[PDB]
Amino acid sequence: LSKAVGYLTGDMKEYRIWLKDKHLALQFIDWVLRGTAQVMFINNPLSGLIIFIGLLIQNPWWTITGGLGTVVSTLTALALGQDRSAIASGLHGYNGMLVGLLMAVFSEKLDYYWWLLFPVTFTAMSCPVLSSALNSIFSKWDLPVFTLPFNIAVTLYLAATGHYNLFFPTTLVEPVSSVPNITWTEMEMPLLLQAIPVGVGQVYGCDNPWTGGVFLVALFISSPLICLHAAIGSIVGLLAALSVATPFETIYTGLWSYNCVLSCIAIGGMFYALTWQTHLLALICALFCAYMEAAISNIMSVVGVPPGTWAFCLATIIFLLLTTNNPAIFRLPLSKVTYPEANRIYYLTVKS
Amino acid sequence: LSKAVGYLTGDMKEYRIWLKDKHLALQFIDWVLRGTAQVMFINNPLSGLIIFIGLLIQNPWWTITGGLGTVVSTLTALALGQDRSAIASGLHGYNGMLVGLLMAVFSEKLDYYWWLLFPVTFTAMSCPVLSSALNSIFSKWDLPVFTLPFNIAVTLYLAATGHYNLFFPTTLVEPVSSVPNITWTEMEMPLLLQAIPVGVGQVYGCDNPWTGGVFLVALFISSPLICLHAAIGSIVGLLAALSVATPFETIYTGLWSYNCVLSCIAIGGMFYALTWQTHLLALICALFCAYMEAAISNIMSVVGVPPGTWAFCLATIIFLLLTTNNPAIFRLPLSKVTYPEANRIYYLTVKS
Amino acid sequence: LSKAVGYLTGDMKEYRIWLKDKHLALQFIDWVLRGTAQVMFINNPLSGLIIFIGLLIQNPWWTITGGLGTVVSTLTALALGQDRSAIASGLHGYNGMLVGLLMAVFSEKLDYYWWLLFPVTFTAMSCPVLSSALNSIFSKWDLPVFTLPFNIAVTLYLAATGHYNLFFPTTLVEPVSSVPNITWTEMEMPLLLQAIPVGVGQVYGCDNPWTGGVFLVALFISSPLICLHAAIGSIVGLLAALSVATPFETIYTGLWSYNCVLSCIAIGGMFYALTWQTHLLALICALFCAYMEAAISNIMSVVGVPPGTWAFCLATIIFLLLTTNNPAIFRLPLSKVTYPEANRIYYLTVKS
């Protein structure tokens, strides 16, 4: 009905106010769901539930590791006396979600290698510390960290263990050593379009198109503008992949579009007031993220580490630090950032 | 005559005031020339013309790519609402000049590979964004970026494409793997001295001695102190190359002196009030830049990327952040920095 | 007697006040001794003497290079007009001590290769500049550099020269390329416990257990809490080495515990008011430093450079930038940091 279309969209402030006075177990589950959703800048528990459903569709071992990471990161943020409003908003759980997910994804062992849950825990514990340190650094420029605890922690882990580790071996990443055989006639446009939901789903490390579809559904039910910019960023990523002559097997996998999804979501509406100048700037940031992800992948394959989400964080920080005399390119303060619709409403209200 | 020796030297403020009220096409050409000259801290359109002549002497394809990069960077700075006084001073064109130049230099394809003009444009467009982000960062310490948009953009491009790219392959850079055979009797001092103008010309990527001579001529006609410090920095680079046992073929090429030229120019008179303490500090910064360029070259050859001008930027930022109780080592504010002669005049006026 | 137990412990303020009015040669020797001791956060000349004795026990060539580095760094800090109170406190000599030490340790040539004293001097001269630049950066967050001049300088040197240099070749560092054969039955617990003093001694690059014992003695006679946290950090390093499946030959060498010693010393009492929360945070920082040192070692072996003390500096900066609502985790201002006992006394006095 029309009544649920108000209590299920946005950040779900009504449900948050209703749950604020309940058992702390339910509040912790709500925080874990919001942290699951917050990977794509969504503070919605129902979106988090749908994202968890998608993770289960992809790989139940991966969602086990991700849930463990989120729980451990939220608990470490509680124990470290972090801001309760940030913990209740899932801002201390998405880095741990990604840590657990990508530590299960890049594990050379089989599924359900239960010994992997010790590094998952010990690395997800270090996400609140990195988040607080990087916030102490960035607070002088009103910048978010965006995934930098996760990137630092997972790069540290995948370099400490490496492929030739005895307990927790990682997958082998090697630099390119031969000009790829690219036959442009053997090109599947069905798979190219399928790489848009796969590109959205690769934000969590899931190469299944149905999980990407579920993620898109969650994005839409929280904020349609976030879903639109996610789709457009994935398209931009695919296009930039094609423009630099990339093997089609890498474009189909979505390994070229998940760093542009987050950049488009962040620039177009989330941390800039959404206008058409902001939309073009988001497209430019998605393109810059695609090319920077190419660079960082080719550069970190030498060390044997996957690119992670370094490209997204770096280029989004770059485009947030950009200063423009255009009054239509307006960067919202970090305290007034909820989602593109409310952001645009606040922008219009403070401008007029 | 003596009259032109006033309207052709310095930043050419008289010609700038005369052109301020003319057709915007002429003003844009003036901005492009000033941006060409601003690579070596020179805000002079005639110096930019002489530098363009030198680029034509080296390789007309390289000057085509460089001119395209400068034009595209100035246009992107205009579209992004950047500061008009900084665009009119060429501060938004030298990074694009270097981007285009070094993207044509490190291209595996032949000359006039017209498809290279698309990455040149798309990478020169990203130089104003990087410049504005790094200025938002550095404004808290009164620091210039010095070439950091260019370094970031070109490293990103040369890592995204790489040697094994299908469309835009780059030259192969490999780390050292054997102790070089250095015969100190087969040593040409003529070529050693020729490596000083070649070292000045390698700032733009030109290994021809006549282009380096033309660059020196431009430096002198704008500011004789800049030309002197450029020559001394190139000498210091050559000496530091000899001191660490470098193959003579690399010293002759000037690949050891172009990162010390810029450092000496920046420290001795440009961003410090020129004294003898400042001169010694500039020599020390040139030596530090030579050794840091050795390090960064040996370190980035593993990733297959040339050192660029990372050494210069890093060591110059280091020597500008240096705090000294010596009243003779005075760092000018970024608003009062034009060229060493005017800088010293301002220093004397505000000190006395 | 009980009288010397007051004039030999702590920062030796009485002896400093007595020597303040003597020949500048004696004052310079005192500064060099304090700089030798300041590697492990100790401003004590007797501790510096004992550390020099330990360096002589390890390798007289290494202590020659270290002493030369300390002298050259203190002289360069004097010539660069640095703060006299920081030079008198050895804050400008420990980076040069480590530079000289680790440049002699990682030299492919034999002992007493007297030509190595030129790079030692020229690299120790660059430690005051790096220290002043990084202090100008960190002063906005009240952070110490902790060894960052040393890390930058020594990484720069070992990358500029490299293994295949003709004058100053360095030792060959190669990345791991095969899963290590780890026989847990062939495990020596005697050597495991011996790796605690060896882990403390590897802070200076000394793998001898007697030098580590001497270092522990110096730590204790200056501040027993510093010695305790050094031992605990070395233990934590050994444990984290065991937890990630490390070859026993690397654990015995102490190459896994010297980056946790400094982190534990820095967090537990030195730069945080020593409590039990601070002690647990120091253990966590030591564990994070062990894993980050694993990562940085595996990552910098690709470039052929040893990890140095990058892990310590980075993780300690991370844990100092951490902001906590816990009133018991209190970060002292940089001006009121002498040693854990005086730090705790000051904390109690300002809290009550």
Written as one string, the DSSP assignment of C254-308 is TTTTHHHHHHHHIIIIISB---HHHHHHHHHHHHHHHHHHHHHHHHHTTTT---T
DSSP assignment string, A266-331:
IIIIISB---HHHHHHHHHHHHHHHHHHHHHHHHHTTTT---TTHHHHHHHHHHHH---S-TTS-B
Sign of CA dihedral B330, B333, B334, B337: negative
Q: Report the C-alpha gap between B29 and B345 in whole angstroms.
A: 30
Q: Which two tokens stand for residue C229?
A: 């946290």
CB–CB of C169 and B179 under 8 A? yes
Q: Note whether A326 contacts B164, CB cutoff 8 Å.
A: no
The nearest alpha carbon in chain A to B140 belongs to A140
Q: Coil, strand, or helix at residue B4? A: helix
Q: If we measure between CA atoms, which residue out of B345, B280, B348, B347 comes closest to residue B319? A: B280
Q: Rg of chain A's alpha carbons, rounded to an integer?
A: 19
For tokens 């006395």, name the residue: B352
C351 vs chain B: nearest CA distance in angstroms?
Answer: 33
Q: Quick one: three-class SS letters along A144-164?
A: CCCCHHHHHHHHHHHHHCCCC
- C331 in helix, strand or coil? strand
Distance of CA B193 to the CA centre of its chain: 21
Contact B109, B169 (CB under 8 A): yes
A245 CB neighbour count, 10 Å cutoff: 16
Q: Which domains, and CATH codes, for chain C?
A: 190-352 (1.10.3430.10)
Per the document, the length of chain B is 352
Cα of C7 to nearest chain A Cα, Å: 39
**Nearest C-alpha of chain B: how many angstroms from C321?**
19
Give the C-alpha separation, B160 to B144, whole Å: 27
Contacts of A among chains (3+ CB pairs under 8 A)? B, C
Interface test with C, best of B292, B293, B302 (most C CBs within 10 A): B292
* Separation CA C216–CA C196 (nearest Å): 10
C-alpha span between C290 and C271 (Å, rounded)? 19
Contact: B80, A180; criterion CB under 8 Å = no
CB distance C337 to C270 below 8 Å: yes
Neighbours of chain C (3+ CB pairs under 8 A): A, B
User: What are the tokens at A82?
Assistant: 């972090």
Mutate to test the interface with C, among A166, A167, A296 (most CBs of C within 10 A): A166
DSSP secondary structure string, C27-62?
A: HHHHHHHHHHHGGGT---HHHHHHHHHHHHHH-HHH
Q: Are residues A322 and B165, on separate chains, in Cβ contact within 8 Å?
A: no
Q: Residue B347: CB partners within 8 Å, gap ≥ 6? A: B273, B274, B330, B332
Cβ contact C216:C209 at 8 Å: no
CA atoms within 13 A on the CB side of B85: 2
How far apart CA C151 and CA A196 sit, in angstroms, is 44
Per-residue DSSP letter, A172: P
Residue type for position B153: A
How large is the angle between the packed helices A148-160 and A117-124, nearest 10 degrees?
A: 140
Note whether A129 contacts C179, CB cutoff 8 Å. Answer: no
Q: Where are the alpha helices (DSSP H) in C106-208?
A: 117-124, 126-138, 148-160, 189-201
Residue C283 tokens, joined: 């253990």
Question: Chain-centre distance of CA C318, in angstroms?
Answer: 17
Give the Cβ contact number of residue C65 at 10 Å. 30
Query: Please, are residues C87 and B325 in contact by the beta-carbon 8 Å criterion?
Result: no
Contact between chains at A319 and B126 (C-beta distance less than 8 A): no
Distance CA A153, CA A160 (A): 10
Structure-block tokens of residue A306: 């996957």
C-alpha gyration radius of chain B:
19
Closest CA to C267 of C195, C197, C205, C318: C318
In this structure, which amino acid lies at residue A333? P
**CB of B38 within 8 A of CB of B145?**
no
Widest Cα–Cα separation across chain B: 62
Round to whole Å and give the CA distance between B47 and A303: 44
Contact (CB<8Å) C294/A159: yes
Q: How many residues does chain C have?
A: 352
Cα separation, A131 vs C221, in Å, equals: 38
* DSSP track, B250-312: HHHTTTTTHHHHHHHHIIIIISB---HHHHHHHHHHHHHHHHHHHHHHHHHTTTT---TTHHH
Q: Strand, helix or coil at B1? A: coil
CA distance C167 to B285: 23
Q: A321 Cβ partners below 8 Å, 6+ apart?
A: A141, A143, B132, B133, B134, B136, B137
Task: Give dist(CA B70, CA B121) in Å, integer.
Answer: 9
Which of B288, B299, B322 minimises the CB distance to C303?
B299
Show which residues on chain B lie within 8 Å of chain C, measured between beta carbons.
Answer: 140-141, 176-180, 182, 244-245, 284, 287-288, 291-292, 294-296, 298-299, 302, 317-319, 321-326, 329
Distance CA B16, CA B31 (A): 10
Contact A298 B160 (CB under 8 A): yes
Residue contacts between B and C (CB atoms, under 8 Å): 80
